[PDB]
Design a protein around this ligand. Sequence first.
Ligand SMILES: Cc1cc(O)nc2sc(C(=O)c3ccccc3)c(N)c12
Ligand SMILES: O=c1ccn([C@H]2C[C@H](O)[C@@H](COP(=O)(O)O)O2)c(=O)[nH]1
Ligand SMILES: O=c1ccn([C@H]2C[C@H](O)[C@@H](COP(=O)(O)O)O2)c(=O)[nH]1
Lengths: 289, 282
Amino acid sequence: MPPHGELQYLGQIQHILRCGVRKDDRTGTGTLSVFGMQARYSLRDEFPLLTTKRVFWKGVLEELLWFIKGSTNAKELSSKGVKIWDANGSRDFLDSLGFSTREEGDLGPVYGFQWRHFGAEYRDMESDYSGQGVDQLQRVIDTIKTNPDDRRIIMCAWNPRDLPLMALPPCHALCQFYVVNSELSCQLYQRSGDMGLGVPFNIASYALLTYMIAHITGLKPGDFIHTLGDAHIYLNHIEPLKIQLQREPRPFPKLRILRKVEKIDDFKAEDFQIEGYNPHPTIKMEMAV
Amino acid sequence: MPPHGELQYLGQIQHILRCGVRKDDRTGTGTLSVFGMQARYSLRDEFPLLTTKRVFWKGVLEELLWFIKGSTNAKELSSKGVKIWDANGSRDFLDSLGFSTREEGDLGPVYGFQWRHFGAEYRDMESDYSGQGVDQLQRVIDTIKTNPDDRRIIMCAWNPRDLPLMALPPCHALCQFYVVNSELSCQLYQRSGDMGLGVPFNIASYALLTYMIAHITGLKPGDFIHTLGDAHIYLNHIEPLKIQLQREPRPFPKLRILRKVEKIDDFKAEDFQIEGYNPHPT
Ligand SMILES: Cc1cc(O)nc2sc(C(=O)c3ccccc3)c(N)c12
Ligand SMILES: O=c1ccn([C@H]2C[C@H](O)[C@@H](COP(=O)(O)O)O2)c(=O)[nH]1
Ligand SMILES: O=c1ccn([C@H]2C[C@H](O)[C@@H](COP(=O)(O)O)O2)c(=O)[nH]1
C-alpha cells in the first residue's frame, strides 16, 4: 500500500534534527533550523490530523471559523476555550510592542482582517468594515465555481502596509488553490513554522479550510501541499520530539460534514464530525513567547 | 394630554419616590420600592431610548444578539466590549454558588439557553444543543407568521427546574407578543427592576426585540408594555434620580434597519442605525 501520510512530517522533523543548524533568536531559546521544505498530504479520504501526538482539534476548528468571520479579537476566540492567541493579545505583550492604547485581545489586522477586508484602513478590532477592502475569500470561492482552471486563485495574508499594526505578522503569507478533474487542491506557503508546536496545528487548519471550500463548490478534496521557509525546532523541543519520533503513526481520521452548507459564512462548529481519531497522548511543548 | 412617553418612566420614578416603602435586599443597600407597576411605550416611528440619562445602546444591541445566538458565555459578550454580565461570570462570584467545577464566564442556563433550548439538559456553555429543547424564539416567529390571533405567544425564561444552575435568576420571566392590525406589540414581565440603571436598559432591549421580530414578520411595531414586580430605587440613587427627574425629556430617536433580513439569526449589529439620539449627560 502507499506509505502513511504522517511520515511526511516525521521525516521533516528528522531532517532538521540531523541536518539542522543552530540559530539564536528573540525568545532566548535557540533553534535548529532549515530553510525550504515541502510536503504533500492527500485529503482523500483521510484527513491529515496528526496521530503521533494529539492535536488541538477543538482549537483548530474554532479558530478557522473565527477567521471566516473576519475576527481579529483574541478574546472572542479565547472565550470559546481556545487560548492559542492570548499570549499575543495580552495587555503585557501588546504594551511591549508600543500598543499602549489598544484593547486587550486586539491582534491587529491579521488573518481575519486580510482574508475579507484586505486594503481596508484598520481602526480597531470592533469597528465596522463591511464593504471595505477586498474579500479574498469569496473572490476565491466564486472563482473555483466559475473558472476552475484559474492559476491565480490566491489568498494573501501578507500586507506590508498593515505590518506595524499586527501583534504578530502572518505565518501564512499566502495560500493558493487548484482544481483539476473537479478535485480541489491547496498549497500553503508558510514563512516560519514551529515544527514542534505549531506545524501540526497548521496542517489541520488548511486541510480543514480545503474541505470547507470543496463542500461549498461541489468539489472533492485532493492534496494539501505544505511549503515552508524557516522550518525550525526550538532547542527545548528536541527531547519531546525525539520521544514522538519513536511512535508509529496510526491511520488518519476521516472528516464528516454533517449538513449541506450553502455559503462559507454559515458554517458552524457542530457541522463537522471527526471519525476514528486514535492519537497517541499529547506532549507538552513550551510556546516560546 | 397624558404621557407620552419617556414621561411614563419618570412618572414611575416619581411614584416610587412619593409612594415608595423602604425595604432591604440582598446587597444590604436598601431601597424605596413599589410592587406592581406598568407603563406603555409606543414604538410607532419612534424608538423608546430614554433621553434624560444616557442608555448604553451598544450593550442593548450586542446583548440582544447574544441572547438570540443562544449564548450564556459571559466572556463571549465581554469580548464584544460590553461587560455587563462580567460581574457574575467571575470565579470569585461563580463558586460563591458552589460552581467550583465550572469554567469562568459560564453563567449557566440563563436567558439565551431558555429562549432557544428550553427544557434541554444544560451541561456547559461551549456545548452542542442542536435540536435539543424547545426553541421558544423561533416558535414565536412561526406563530405570528401563521396565527396572528393566537394568545399563547409566550417566550418564558423562568425555568424553575434550572434555577439551581443559573448564575442569576432571570429578571425577565416572560414576554408575550400580540398582533393586531398588522402591528406587533410586546409585553414584558420583569420580576425585579431598578429604575436607576437596569430598567431603562431593559426597555431598550425589548423594544429592540419587537423591532427585529416585526421586521422578520412584515409587521409594523406597536406598543411595548413594561410590567414590573418589585420596582425599586436604590437609596444612593435617590439624589441623582431627583436631578435627572427635572430634566426636560427630548424626543425619542428613530431606529432604522439597513437591510432586509430573512431569519432572526442573520441580524448583525451593523444592520442597525440609530438616528437623532440626543440624551443629556449623567
Ligand atoms: C513560538 C510562538 C511565539 C509567539 O510569539 N507566538 C506564537 S503562536 C504559535 C502557534 O503555534 C499557534 C498556531 C496556530 C494558532 C495560534 C498559535 C507559536 N508557536 C508562537
Ligand atoms: O500559526 C502560526 C503562528 C506562529 N508560528 C510560529 C513560528 C515561530 O516559532 C513563531 C513566529 O515567530 P516569528 O516568525 O515572528 O519569528 O511562531 C507557527 O508556527 N504557526
Ligand atoms: O436584566 C436585568 C437583570 C437584573 N436586574 C436587577 C434588579 C435587581 O436589582 C437585581 C436582581 O436581584 P434579584 O432579583 O435576584 O434580587 O438586578 C435588572 O433590573 N435587569
